[PDB]
């Protein structure tokens, strides 16, 4: 209903967010792999600010971030730790007019009681 | 009309559910039946049970989907000995917040039908 | 306009049905193969009934079926003989709410004066 | 506006028709012309003539499509020495019942143009 | 706004026209090729006339053509020289009812001050 | 709201613009950053400057896109040492006439960010 990313000491209004995890399955349909993925894909409005891009281009240190989902009270909160921005796009279209879509790849993601942690 | 998933001691309203099975053919059926993955689409709440069930434990589980019309129980898809093998959650201010996940199970059953994998 | 499948001693209202046949063509565009395909793809409403699925999962014997197409009088009739259900999907979507799509692979299909018969 | 296929001693109303031809190019045209398959889309009736013509016999045939406007004959695509190499019939209560089929022919002709395959 | 193809001593009203050119780029994103493409794709109404097709099927000699773009005065003009029709489709659909789409591959294309010329 | 490209000593109204960058990952980021191509979509006029800049010369160039809201300058994407590596112009009586082209540049800059290729 409302989603607020805390990132790089700033807040951004989230238009849309998705994260996904997967395990392989063999022929007999038995799970045949550990869990992989956990990339977070975020979509936020553009302003004069270039902090997200700077965070990808201008430095090399891992970061943390926080998305808080609300209704109308904090419903739940997706956080990541030790991540890097691995995909960035900014788009203007004079017809949501100006926006950024970027993906974080992080060693740890957490939300409510769940934790996913990569093999690094 | 209405579908109710019973999973992990909780109930979830099903926005959409699909399960499928297939056999190969040659140039004549040429294989045993495979697939039987169940794909479920449910609303998100404060709950993280589905994901916890994927990430936080390793033990197979059972689940139950009950399909209804107007008011009784029309039929019921159950699985046994399954694992969540695909999860995605999406938020979009434009159904606002939802989970789509896939169960891979050794046994699925509905009405009089039973499908059971070679394990 | 109205299509009625007779299958497994029951009748089902057909939402949609398609069957297809094909022959290869070489470079010069000459037909370069016998006719293959003839799979029938059927789409019917779900009820409490699980006969179609049972017919795929619970037994192994070939079957016959019959689709009668009407207008408003029997217009024509697609029949198959010695077939097997090789693909099944059932879908519920609380937005046609609940339906089955399945494919029959059969040694013989017939409609009006046409007959197609596989090499088995 | 209106298209009428004459085939197998019968007439069929054409919902849609396309034919195409092409030549390859290199990094300059680099091939003779190929294709010339005709793709036809017509209403289904009690008739099974088109399918019978594919399944039940083996002899090449001719056909004729006449394109009209308002009332005469605008132009006419004809084929000679062809075979039906693809057939699909579809019923859908939502054009309700139709056939889509492809003719592969040695010769197609329309207005002053002629295309003829290397056979 | 209005586009008029002059071709084979006739004029045709252009429903739509597109041409495109491209150069490869390496990993470092440096251009890594000369310019290629320059095929023109044209879309015109069908009449009783079969001149375009005849030009593809019935002869083998290169040709020239001219598209004039207007507003409401000639805005600019795409011309080609030494070209061949390498793709033709005609479509009727009783739902633009009857039309031709064809592609010209030409050694030289020119528009305003630009010229592109293939290696033949 | 409004975007103005300054290129080849002229200005063009931007219908749409996108630029993107990415890094590969392994089974963890596993590459330096690549991409940074800018994709621009502008109206056609009597002008052929963009195409001339691709076809008629061979020297790298710079350009400037200024993004605005309501009235000042919100931010500005600039490139340096670039080449037009993809051009398409389309006319369609149904935006009627437009150009879509891609710039590949050694350096792009916007607000405080800078991206620079390994050349």
3-state SS, E34-98, equals CCEEEEEEEEEECCCCCHHHHHHHCCCCCEEEEEEEECCCEEEEEEEEEEEEEEEEEEEECCCCE
Q: Which residues contact C108 (CB under 8 A, 6 or more apart)?
A: C80, C81, C82, C115, C116, C117, C118
What is the SS3 assignment for C62?
coil
**Cα distances (angstroms) measured from residue A5 to each of A28, A44, A69, B85, B92:** 41, 9, 9, 28, 14
Work out how many CB contacts closer than 8 A connect A with B: 89
Interface contact D20-E89, CB threshold 8 A: yes
**Contact residues on chain E for D20, CB-CB shorter than 8 A:** 87-90
Q: Which residues of A touch B (CB under 8 A)?
A: 1-3, 14-25, 27-31, 35, 69, 75-76, 111-116
Enter the DSSP assignment of F44. -
Alpha helices, DSSP H only, in chain C?
Answer: 51-57
- Point out the residue among E53, E95, E98 whose CB comes nearest to the CB of D113: E53
With beta carbons less than 8 A apart as the criterion, state whether B2 and B67 touch. Answer: yes
Q: Which chains touch D (3 or more CB pairs under 8 A)?
A: C, E
Q: Which residues contact A19 (CB under 8 A, 6 or more apart)?
A: A37, A38, A39, A40, A41, A78, A109, B88, B89
**Cα distances (angstroms) measured from residue E1 to each of A98, F51, F92:** 29, 20, 8
Phi, psi of E82 (to 5 degrees): 65, 55
Q: Which chains touch F (3 or more CB pairs under 8 A)?
A: A, E
**Cα distances (angstroms) measured from residue C15 to each of C2, C57, D90, D91, D94:** 9, 23, 11, 8, 9
Residue of B107, B116, D92 lying closest to C101 (CA atoms): D92
What is the SS3 assignment for F99?
strand
Whole-angstrom Cα distance, residue F103 to residue F85?
6
**Contact residues on chain B for A68, CB-CB shorter than 8 A:** none
Whole-angstrom Cα distance, residue B49 to residue B56?
10
**Contact residues on chain D for E50, CB-CB shorter than 8 A:** 75, 110-113
- Distance separating the N- and C-terminal Cα atoms of chain A: 34
Whole-angstrom Cα distance, residue B6 to residue B40?
12
- Point out the residue among E14, E29, E116 whose CB comes nearest to the CB of F55: E116
**Contact residues on chain C for B2, CB-CB shorter than 8 A:** 94
Interface contact D117-C20, CB threshold 8 A: no
**Contact residues on chain F for A39, CB-CB shorter than 8 A:** 25
Q: Which residues of D touch C (CB under 8 A)?
A: 34-37, 45-48, 51-52, 54-56, 83, 85-94, 96-97, 104-106, 117-119
**Cα distances (angstroms) measured from residue E18 to each of A46, A81, D29, E100:** 32, 48, 19, 14
With beta carbons less than 8 A apart as the criterion, state whether F98 and F40 touch. Answer: no
Q: In angstroms, how far is CA E10 from the centroid of its own chain? A: 15
What is the SS3 assignment for C57?
helix
Residue of C70, C73, C11, C71 lying closest to C42 (CA atoms): C11
Contact yes or no, F with D (3+ CB pairs under 8 Å): no
- Residue A25, classified by CB atoms within 10 Å of its CB into exposed (0-12), middle (13-18) or buried (19+), is middle
Contact yes or no, D with C (3+ CB pairs under 8 Å): yes
Strand partners, B64: B6, B78
Whole-angstrom Cα distance, residue B84 to residue B8?
12
**Contact residues on chain D for C28, CB-CB shorter than 8 A:** 117-119
| Gaps in chain B following residue numbers (C to N > 2.5 A) | 27, 71, 94
Whole-angstrom Cα distance, residue F100 to residue F40?
6
Strand partners, D20: E89
Alpha carbon of D12: minimum distance to chain C alpha carbons (Å): 17
Extract the runs of DSSP E, i.e. beta strands, from chain D: 2-7, 10-22, 34-43, 61-68, 73-92, 97-110, 113-116
Q: Which chains touch E (3 or more CB pairs under 8 A)?
A: D, F
Q: Which residues of E touch D (CB under 8 A)?
A: 36, 39, 46-50, 53-54, 56-58, 84, 86-95, 97-98, 105, 107, 118-120
Alpha carbon of E59: minimum distance to chain F alpha carbons (Å): 29
Enter the DSSP assignment of D46. S
Q: Which residues contact A109 (CB under 8 A, 6 or more apart)?
A: A19, A38, A40, A78, A79, A80, A81, A115, A116
Backbone Cα Rg of chain A:
16
**Cα distances (angstroms) measured from residue E44 to each of A92, E6, E55:** 33, 12, 15
Which of B16, B19, B21 to mutate to test binding with chain C, by most C CBs within 10 Å of its CB?
B21
What count of Cα atoms within 13 Å lies in the side-chain half-sphere of residue C4? 12
With beta carbons less than 8 A apart as the criterion, state whether C4 and C13 touch. Answer: yes
Alpha carbon of A34: minimum distance to chain B alpha carbons (Å): 10
**What determination technique applies here?**
X-ray
Phi, psi of D93 (to 5 degrees): -65, 80
Interface contact D117-C29, CB threshold 8 A: yes
Task: Tell me the residue range of the domain where D73 lies.
Answer: 1-119
Tally the domains of chain D: 1
Alpha carbon of C104: minimum distance to chain D alpha carbons (Å): 15
With beta carbons less than 8 A apart as the criterion, state whether C99 and B17 touch. Answer: no
Whole-angstrom Cα distance, residue C40 to residue C54?
18
Strands B61-68 and B73-92, sheet pairing:
antiparallel
Q: Which chains touch B (3 or more CB pairs under 8 A)?
A: A, C
Alpha carbon of D57: minimum distance to chain E alpha carbons (Å): 29
- Point out the residue among C1, C25, C115 whose CB comes nearest to the CB of D96: C1
Alpha carbon of A21: minimum distance to chain B alpha carbons (Å): 5
Q: How many angstroms is the resolution?
A: 2.0
């Amino acid at each position: 209903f409302r989603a607020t990313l805390s990132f790089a000491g700033k807040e951004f209004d989230v238009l849309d967010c998705t994260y996904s995890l997967k395990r392989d399955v063999d022929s007999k349909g038995r799970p045949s792999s550990n869990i992989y993925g956990g990339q977070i894909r975020l979509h936020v409005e553009s302003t004069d600010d270039t902090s997200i891009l700077e965070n990808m281009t201008n430095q090399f240190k891992p970061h943390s971030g926080s998305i808080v989902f609300k209704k109308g009270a904090k419903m739940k909160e997706l956080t990541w730790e030790n991540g890097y921005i691995t995909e960035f796009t900014e788009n203007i279209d004079i017809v949501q007019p100006m926006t950024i879509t970027f993906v974080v790849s992080a060693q740890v993601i957490k939300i409510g009681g769940a934790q996913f942690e990569q093999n690094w």
